[PDB]
Design an enzyme around this catalytic site. Structure first.
Site, PDB file in Angstrom:
ATOM      1  N   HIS C 150      11.123  10.108 -42.848  1.00 48.18           N
ATOM      2  CA  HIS C 150      10.346   9.595 -43.966  1.00 48.18           C
ATOM      3  C   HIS C 150       9.245   8.695 -43.435  1.00 48.18           C
ATOM      4  CE1 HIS C 150      13.452   6.340 -43.559  1.00 48.18           C
ATOM      5  NE2 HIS C 150      12.393   5.575 -43.749  1.00 48.18           N
ATOM      6  N   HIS C 206      15.514   8.742 -49.384  1.00 50.81           N
ATOM      7  CA  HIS C 206      14.073   8.669 -49.568  1.00 50.81           C
ATOM      8  C   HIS C 206      13.359   9.514 -48.523  1.00 50.81           C
ATOM      9  CE1 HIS C 206      15.143   5.771 -46.584  1.00 50.81           C
ATOM     10  NE2 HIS C 206      13.913   5.333 -46.390  1.00 50.81           N
ATOM     11  N   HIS C 220       5.641   2.085 -41.328  1.00 53.45           N
ATOM     12  CA  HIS C 220       6.352   2.713 -40.223  1.00 53.45           C
ATOM     13  C   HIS C 220       6.620   4.170 -40.563  1.00 53.45           C
ATOM     14  CE1 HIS C 220       9.911   1.600 -42.739  1.00 53.45           C
ATOM     15  NE2 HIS C 220      10.371   2.754 -42.287  1.00 53.45           N
ATOM     16  N   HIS C 252      20.560  -1.919 -43.423  1.00 56.84           N
ATOM     17  CA  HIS C 252      19.684  -2.162 -44.559  1.00 56.84           C
ATOM     18  C   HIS C 252      20.468  -2.006 -45.855  1.00 56.84           C
ATOM     19  CE1 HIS C 252      15.951  -3.304 -43.054  1.00 56.84           C
ATOM     20  NE2 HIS C 252      15.228  -2.212 -43.228  1.00 56.84           N
ATOM     21  N   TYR C 261      13.936  -1.428 -36.018  1.00 55.50           N
ATOM     22  CA  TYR C 261      12.483  -1.362 -36.091  1.00 55.50           C
ATOM     23  C   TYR C 261      11.887  -1.756 -34.749  1.00 55.50           C
ATOM     24  CZ  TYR C 261      12.750  -0.896 -41.174  1.00 55.50           C
ATOM     25  OH  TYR C 261      13.014  -0.451 -42.451  1.00 55.50           O
ATOM     26  N   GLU C 271      10.988   3.487 -36.795  1.00 55.14           N
ATOM     27  CA  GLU C 271      12.346   3.189 -37.233  1.00 55.14           C
ATOM     28  C   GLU C 271      13.283   4.310 -36.804  1.00 55.14           C
ATOM     29  OE1 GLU C 271      14.852   2.228 -41.312  1.00 55.14           O
ATOM     30  OE2 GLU C 271      13.127   3.554 -41.524  1.00 55.14           O
TER      31      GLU C 271
END
Ligand SMILES: [Ca+2]
Ligand SMILES: [Ca+2]
Ligand SMILES: [Ca+2]
Ligand SMILES: [Ca+2]
Ligand SMILES: [Fe+3]
Ligand SMILES: [Fe+3]
Ligand SMILES: [Fe+3]
Ligand SMILES: [Fe+3]
Lengths: 293, 293, 293, 293
Positions: C150, C206, C220, C252, C261, C271
């Site tokens: 993503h 996502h 990112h 997260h 990160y 990421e």
């Protein structure tokens, strides 16, 4: 003073080519030397001595002897004196009997297995070094075994004939080599018979182990892995190399360690287990397993 | 003979209610007794002695003393004799000075910290038992810490004034308590100054550790976890209990252990780390870390 | 019909040599082609199309455009018709505009980022194959990223000036590209302002995401890893390659994914996150995060 | 539009008490209702609808029907029209036929299994919520299954008699329900016979699966776990609850998922598998497994 840890195991193999590639490609060991008799010596990446495994050409599988490293040279004379007072004949092999290996105290366990104690083996260092080292080395092959961890011996046991070398080995290594018992499997009436014992010098659950059997032999040698994940990775490696698996990945109640059992091309059983499990301590109660379980 | 492992740490807390619930809900310890002075004693689930942590009410944070368990009672007289020949005054607290705790040999490290050695503490057993036990107990709370693993002490160090109690503590525990050095951090010109040392009696990378500092104090006490996963679970628990985190989950080059640093409600730093990392051995080369890294 | 997943991201780099070795040695990508303009195209091992990352030489960092793959060629005309009815001008780049890439529908998001949709890209297959494949390939480098997962875009947001392109992008990709919202971060009075949105076409949490910012840019690009362990291994790889880390390994709350990160040599943030987290579903309630958290 | 995911499975059990405690204590499900006919409805913690498992009292094991949730109510009429044009008779059960469940489109697969499609089921939410939720809930029991993931059906297959309902089911769910094939096992001469097929609507490797067999029945229903560690924890839970295990923890070449097979007290097989494995995509080549492997 005394025994530090398992030093090496000498195994009989029938196909040296197939056996060497197995311990290299599956377990991630590296060959360090070959003697003029055809024997091959290998070590794990997280070991610093010359070798932990000896492959000797033979017409059969099995174990030649088992070797344990002691803290200092003078421990050999002291342990030798304790062993013969117990009633076990010993002999001293001088330095060079095995390549890169100092003098060795040789004797037979009550179960009949040959055991050796050495204080000196050639230092070659680990594959990660000791000045700002990485946690793991690059180019690691196969399961990436850290070190040869322990050895389970099948010990002759005939309760009707009054023969239980699991018990005799257990008494021997405790009273003479100052091992302490961490776990045991009790069978027979009311658990009055020791069928399996695990004993330690380190603070890992077991550095040697004995299991009952009709004849004395080798059950398996075992190699340490870090985590539950590395066991899965090990199973994937064995599948890629077409390895004959004995027991699928499962947690052992003993040692609390997650393990895989499999064979080398000659039939010798190998174990890759992960995790410390618990801290073995001389004041820790012996974990007892009953036959009904 | 000699020291087995860290026995307990006595910490100063300002809010006993908030401190007890922290070590219970976050670390998974259980309270085993409270004395008539208001001190609270807790243990981890995979420990078998009465307690590994003492919380004492105080107007400040910090450490009262650090205690290590020895193999047998007679070791106290032998260690006492070695310590005073080295030049450290000792005293013997008789049994009952602390509840459920035998007699204790008391002395101060060169860095000024009070250290105690005991041989006898009340047995209560682990939460999983020792007859056909489960690998882990049900109803485990928080991170489910296995055991108090080690303690890192801040030791007064002034190189210009000729003061380096990290080195003096390191010499003391090696020569008197037969610890062996496993890792060190070297600073100064060409690494000629020991700023951090890790030492072991078990075969885990470190049971005590010393780090340099302007004044002598407590850096943290640490608790063992099984795997990399349990560290993640620990971070989730600290988030649920609103815990002040010092360092996010990351692998330490030292010990090879994956760790989290965080605080209790009084400011004392705690560590939950996973994994053995490597097998500490008296013949293993000292892992050296240089200041440039 | 419609969008399948993120197709590729085109990044601006200043040092092509340093950038290519980063995405190869750290993330485990492989370079598949270089065009006559100096642009470098790389893919991950568990991807089957020609490339998911374009490195273009430039005097600055940032993103050129973002590309998503659609199910079939005819979807481009249908999506084009929906987009222009919404009020966004589009254009059709013909096949060959990028090497090994079919025709592309080009348009700008409300936030100003250039987005492209293609249906056809050259098939090269994954590194494990599709006839009795292994679960993972040998010789994998670095973190061994499975696929580009993503992209989080920084979207211009000025609540006082009435500008919130996070909301406008969110409405655009839902109504025109049939994305559905899975998670959001609400700020402002009573959470009346969308500051971060995560949207999906797959059933992963996502496939695109928008975060508010003073100017529109690139936050990112992210790469998928299997397990919590592979994240740790990724952190070890970044340490070996001297990688500038932004956030240490931590779970997260968004996506439930454990992530790291870090930056490439040009400053673009990357990421590596592990785990599905949850199954994104069109009937699943939107996970709402409030500003106070 | 169309099918979202597996909705629920209705199983026949002989001992309701023993079956309910199994799905509660071993899999971590919670009972949400019991109807006036004695049927028990349970859901997983990471599901938001009323139930994913129906236990019905019976004199035998097996499956009653299998239900899949569709995106919207109007999809039922459209799918109904496609199914009957294919040649499968359908019927519409009105809302309330099952408690907390909307109207259902009922039909039989070519293999003879009863399949239902619904659009509406009562929302109860997940056990972690959707406003600043935790990644996992406290007090989770057993393996803590996230959700009912898929169902493998044994489909009648007689190649000599010209009967292969695995192929007929595979054609049916692709052409009528717009599933896409992700993996297959090919047997017979040159792999000219589909013996096992895995098909998806989500981007997980499979939401339904068919395996050949002498008679049509239920192979297993499966539940999702996060990581390799949760599988180990699941094996420990099954050992504590005395669960009859079919296959020990091992990675499946199919799905790349690490899995355990075991039974409920009535004989129905259950699977707990971890990991996404790969992202299922309509443009991804079908992973083909050959009979020789
Ligand atoms: Ca051991
Ligand atoms: Ca330790
Ligand atoms: Ca995604
Ligand atoms: Ca699925
Ligand atoms: Fe073993
Ligand atoms: Fe520490
Ligand atoms: Fe991201
Ligand atoms: Fe399955």
């Amino acid at each position: 003073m005394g025994v530090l840890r398992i030093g090496h195991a000498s195994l009989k193999v029938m196909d040296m080519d197939a056996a060497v590639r197995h311990y290299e490609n599956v377990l991630g060991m590296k060959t360090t030397m070959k003697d003029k008799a055809g024997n091959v010596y290998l070590k794990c990446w997280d070991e610093w001595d010359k070798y932990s495994v000896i492959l000797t050409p033979s017409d059969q599988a099995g174990m030649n002897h088992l070797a344990y490293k002691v803290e200092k040279e003078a421990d050999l004379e002291a342990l030798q004196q304790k062993i013969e007072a117990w009633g076990v004949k010993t002999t001293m092999l001088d330095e060079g009997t095995l390549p890169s290996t100092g003098r060795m105290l040789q004797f037979k366990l009550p179960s009949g297995h040959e055991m050796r104690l050495y204080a000196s083996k050639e230092f070659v260092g680990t594959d990660v070094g000791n000045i700002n080292p990485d946690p793991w080395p690059d180019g690691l092959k196969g399961a990436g075994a850290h070190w040869l961890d322990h050895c389970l011996l099948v010990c002759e046991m005939n309760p009707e004939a009054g023969i239980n070398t699991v018990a005799d080995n257990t008494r021997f290594v405790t009273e003479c080599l100052d091992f302490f018992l961490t776990e045991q499997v009790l069978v027979g009436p009311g658990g009055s018979i020791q069928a399996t014992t695990f004993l330690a010098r380190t603070t890992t659950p077991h550095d040697i182990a004995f299991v009952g059997g009709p004849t004395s032999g080798l059950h398996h040698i075992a190699f340490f892995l870090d985590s539950w994940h590395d066991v899965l990775k090990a199973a994937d490696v064995m599948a890629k190399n077409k390895v004959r698996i004995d027991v699928a990945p499962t947690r052992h109640g003993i040692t609390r360690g997650e393990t895989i059992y499999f064979f080398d091309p000659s039939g010798n059983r190998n174990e890759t287990f992960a995790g410390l499990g618990y801290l073995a301590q001389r004041d820790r109660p012996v974990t007892t397993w009953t036959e009904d379980q």
